[PDB]
From a paper:
Here, we describe the crystal structure of the complex formed between [name] and the [name] helicase domain of [name]. We tried to crystallize this complex in the absence or presence of a short RNA oligonucleotide, but only obtained crystals of the complex in the absence of RNA. In the [name]/[name]-HD complex, [name]-HD adopts a conformation similar to that of human [name]-HD bound to UPF2 or ADP and phosphate, with the largest difference observed in the orientation of domain 1B (rotation of this domain by 17 to 19° relative to the RecA1 domain in both cases; ). The [name] protein is composed of 2 domains. Second, a C-terminal region (hereafter referred to as the « arm »; residues 168 to 218) folds into a long α-helix (⍺9) followed by a two-stranded antiparallel β-sheet (strands β6 and β7) and a long unstructured region (residues 202 to 218) to embrace [name]-HD. In total, 39 residues of [name] interact with 44 residues located in the RecA1 domain and in the stalk of [name]-HD to form an interface area of 2,050 Å2. As a result, a parallel β-zipper is formed between strand β7 of [name] and strand β8 of [name] at the interface, generating a three-stranded β-sheet common to the RecA1 domain of [name] and the « arm » of [name]. In conclusion, our crystal structure reveals that [name] interacts primarily with 2 structurally important domains of [name]-HD, namely the RecA1 and stalk domains, and to a lesser extent with the RecA2 domain.
Among these, the nonsense-mediated [name] decay (NMD) pathway is responsible for the rapid detection and degradation of translated mRNAs harboring premature termination codons (PTCs), which can arise from mutations, transcription, or processing errors as well as alternative or defective splicing events. [name] is composed of a PIN domain (for PilT N-terminus) and interacts directly with the helicase domain of [name]. [name] stimulates [name]-HD ATPase activity and strengthens [name]-HD binding to RNA.
Numbering used by the authors:
A (entry chain B): 0 to 218
B (entry chain A): 224 to 851
The structure:
């Protein structure tokens, strides 16, 4: 396909969302082009989880990354970071994108997280950009908070899965879109104290979601 | 060939295909385990129940207490085969389960033409009859969620699937005051929780230890009952939690109906006056009143009277369940045939102690609004099958919703323990948010003579340099020096006037539990009868409960600095939040300090001046080097 997503994927995204990522690679590369960048942080953190925490999801993620790097798949690009790039990227280049008013003490972060920020800034703003728009995929709130402070756009696995369902135009996207427009039609829009988009609805008027057809597991 | 648990599911069919095989794995493992247990040779002690039925008591040594998923009311067959009497079989029901003090199960035998061989003690085997009802309901709930569009609202369906749909709230009249008049006032944390929940289709409440989740949950149910003017379904994985919540709801003036299985109708309860079967019996008149009296004195009914009896009971049960303000039952109990009606508002307490398919059972009854109460920082569900647990069945619905971005509202004022005891658990597991609802003066003993390292700080980490041993099974560890030190602590508490009921000993290893119990019986300074009343168990036994004094025996001490499942943050959290007045931790800091969680604990104890070593009467600061 002609639409292209450019992602830097962290370790938590693999450990928690490996099944979702596998589906993106095999099914979604029809009308979408996926472009992954695997930083050194990811490989080191997945190795730590597999060895010190006996995480079988982290073991499977490392095996999957090897399969991605060995295959010449259509509409899927994967680049594993060369560790020596971390010594070339300036920490001052990361600090130029950091919000001073931000609550996180960026210079006091551990080595692993300092290097993850270097990888992100390299892709988002430096030589690794290639005229593309990059997003960090993470399932760790601390990682997403530090990325936001350094103007690195980030998303969750669910955020990407929803975006790729829209492009694929599957029944999951279409039926959720009907539900959204049903709420917009019957219900009052409000800006909550949190700043969020809330829709007041009547408790007594409920919309049920069509299930469609499908196969159930049987013993 | 099983699909992994995903973050977002395409549809509820994929959701079912993921959880379905995991339920089967658990079911098969549970069933197979009981098949093996049926081969163990047991000793039976006979007695007579008040109703004059025979009681068979016995100990099952093959499996650990947590591995045998046996409930009161469960049917069993007791078999004799030997050279002292012909072959004999007897069917009965479980009336007592093992506790910390009683290692025995008690089976009440059904009356028969052939009497039981009460003169024999050995030659018996016990076979639990497999029902599978709990797992069947979980499977049915998964399937109903997939194919029945009316089982749950569209919004909740999308939220459970991990989909991104616009957030909605209910146009509902909020009360001016959240605390209920004529009743004890909620604190601001509790009040904020009730406030946040009332207009949301889905809420998560986190209730740390001693923070008042019962009064908060009962107040929520009370307001939702007044707002919707409809039945509310209230659930929890365990019967004790259901009874606790039902009692509070009844105290608020709500018409509560407590549904128990037909198997447990004779179980002793604090809320027996709310049991559906007792409400049928008491509120019966006419033909039903007669059929009940007849069945009580005759013990059996004729074919025509049984059909008539069943018809009338069902009709009465439905009328009682329909007129109720709240229906209370366990999560699995929600799947009962008698509750095949609609429940639009559901509150699930202790939802973190159930698997996701177990929580689904009460939610697939036409739910529009769901409140899940729990604590992912405390104990999770019991998953016997490791492959199923590894595949993700240990994750509750409360925890998956957190991974999906749902922030729980936390109750932050604890009323259980001395402020000194709540500090580390609060900082470590609750981001330092816990405040104290009780003072140091409310949790102190004025004339205490106990050798606490610092007077006024009722905690200590008593370092010992003993080494772990291996028990008679080969599968467990013990620590003879820590067991000896444990007795010295207890005796010292006894000398200070503390009663055995006030003391609890928590140890992760069955080897240590058995050794501590035996050791205090033979080498306890004071009367052995005092020490037997001191509860020695694992964290599971103390989950949801409290003691005035807690002794933690870590057991683990080796040159490799390996500590096994002492690594568990959730177990450590529960073990540190059980005490009200005092805490003593026994352990070897040298090996515990390699673990980063335990290293933070030792540093906290050292900062308080509580990390000590030596003789109890001449304690010294522990010399171990701790490096962060």
């Amino acid at each position: 396909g002609s639409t292209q997503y450019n992602f830097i994927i962290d370790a938590s995204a693999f450990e928690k969302g490996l099944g979702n990522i596998k589906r993106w690679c095999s099914d979604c590369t029809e009308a979408v082009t996926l472009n992954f960048y695997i930083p050194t942080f990811t490989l080191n953190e997945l190795d730590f989880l597999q060895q010190r925490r006996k995480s079988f999801a982290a073991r499977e993620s490392l095996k999957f990354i090897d399969r991605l790097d060995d295959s010449k798949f259509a509409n899927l690009k994967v680049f594993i970071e060369f560790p020596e790039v971390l010594d070339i990227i300036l920490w001052s280049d990361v600090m130029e994108h950091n919000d001073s008013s931000g609550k996180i003490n960026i210079a006091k972060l551990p080595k692993r997280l300092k290097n993850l920020l270097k990888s992100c800034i390299y892709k988002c703003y430096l030589e690794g950009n290639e005229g593309l728009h990059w997003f960090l995929i993470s399932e760790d709130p601390q990682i997403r908070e530090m990325a936001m402070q350094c103007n690195i756009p980030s998303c969750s696995i669910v955020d990407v899965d929803s975006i790729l369902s829209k492009d694929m135009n599957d029944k999951s996207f279409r039926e959720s879109e009907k539900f959204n427009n049903m709420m917009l039609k019957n219900g009052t829009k409000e800006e909550s104290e949190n700043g969020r988009e809330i829709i007041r609805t009547n408790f007594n008027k409920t919309v049920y979601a069509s299930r469609g057809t499908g196969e159930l597991w049987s013993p | 060939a099983i699909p992994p648990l995903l973050l977002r599911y395409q549809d509820a069919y994929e959701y079912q295909r993921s959880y379905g095989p995991l339920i089967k794995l658990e079911a098969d493992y549970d069933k197979q385990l009981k098949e093996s247990q049926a081969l163990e040779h047991i000793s039976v002690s006979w007695s007579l129940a008040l109703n004059n039925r025979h009681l068979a008591s016995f100990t099952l040594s093959t499996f650990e207490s947590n591995e045998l998923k046996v409930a009161i009311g469960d049917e069993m067959i007791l078999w004799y085969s030997g050279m002292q009497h012909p072959d004999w079989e007897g069917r009965g029901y479980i009336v007592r389960l093992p506790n910390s003090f009683q290692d025995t199960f008690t089976l009440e035998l059904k009356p028969s033409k052939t009497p039981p061989p009460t003169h024999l003690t050995t030659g018996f085997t016990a076979e639990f009859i497999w029902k599978g009802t709990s797992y069947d309901r979980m499977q049915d709930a998964l399937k109903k969620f997939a194919i029945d569009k009316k089982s749950i609202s569209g919004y909740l369906y999308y939220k459970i699937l991990g989909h991104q749909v616009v957030d909605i709230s209910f146009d509902v009249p909020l009360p001016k005051e959240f605390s209920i008049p004529n009743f004890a006032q909620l604190n601001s944390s509790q009040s904020n929780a009730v406030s946040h929940v009332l207009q949301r289709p889905l809420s998560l409440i986190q209730g740390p230890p001693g923070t008042g989740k019962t009064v908060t949950s009962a107040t929520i149910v009370y307001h939702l009952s007044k707002i919707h003017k409809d039945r509310i379904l209230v659930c929890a994985p365990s019967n004790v939690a259901v009874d606790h919540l039902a009692a509070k709801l009844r105290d608020l003036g709500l018409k509560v109906v407590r549904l128990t299985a037909k198997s447990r109708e004779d179980v002793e309860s604090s809320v027996s006056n709310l049991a559906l079967h007792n409400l049928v019996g008491r509120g019966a008149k006419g033909e039903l009143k007669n059929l009940l009296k007849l069945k009580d004195e005759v013990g059996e009914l004729s074919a025509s009277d049984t059909k008539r009896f069943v018809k009338l009971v069902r009709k009465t049960e439905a009328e009682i369940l329909n007129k109720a303000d709240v229906v209370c039952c366990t999560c699995v109990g929600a799947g009962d045939k008698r509750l095949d009606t609609k429940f639009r508002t559901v509150l699930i307490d202790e939802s973190t102690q159930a698997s996701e398919p177990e929580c689904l059972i009460p939610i697939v009854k036409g739910a529009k609004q769901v409140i899940l109460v729990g604590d992912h920082q405390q104990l999770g569900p019991v998953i016997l099958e490791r492959k199923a647990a590894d595949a993700g069945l240990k994750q509750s619905l409360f925890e998956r919703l957190i991974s999906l971005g749902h922030v729980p509202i936390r109750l932050e004022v604890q009323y259980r323990m001395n402020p000194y005891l709540s500090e580390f658990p609060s900082n470590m597991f609750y981001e330092g948010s816990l405040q104290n609802g009780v003072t140091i003066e409310q949790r102190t003993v004025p004339n205490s003579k106990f050798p606490w390292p610092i007077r006024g700080i009722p905690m200590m980490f008593w370092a010992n340099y003993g080494r772990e041993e291996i028990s008679a099974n080969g599968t467990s560890f013990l620590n003879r020096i820590e067991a000896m030190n444990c007795e010295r602590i207890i005796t010292k508490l006894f000398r200070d006037g503390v009663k055995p009921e006030q003391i609890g000993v928590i140890t992760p290893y069955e080897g240590q539990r058995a050794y501590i119990l035996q050791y205090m019986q033979m080498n306890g300074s004071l009367d052995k009868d005092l020490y037997i009343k001191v509860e020695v168990a694992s964290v599971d036994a103390f989950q949801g409960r409290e003691k005035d004094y807690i002794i933690l025996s870590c057991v683990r001490a080796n040159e490799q600095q390996a500590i096994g499942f002492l690594r568990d943050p959730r177990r450590l959290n529960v073990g540190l939040t059980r005490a009200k007045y005092g805490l003593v931790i026994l352990g070897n800091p040298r090996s515990l300090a390699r673990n980063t969680l335990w290293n933070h604990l030792l540093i906290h104890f050292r900062e308080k001046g509580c990390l000590v070593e030596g003789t109890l009467d001449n304690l010294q600061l522990c010399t171990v080097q701790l490096v962060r």
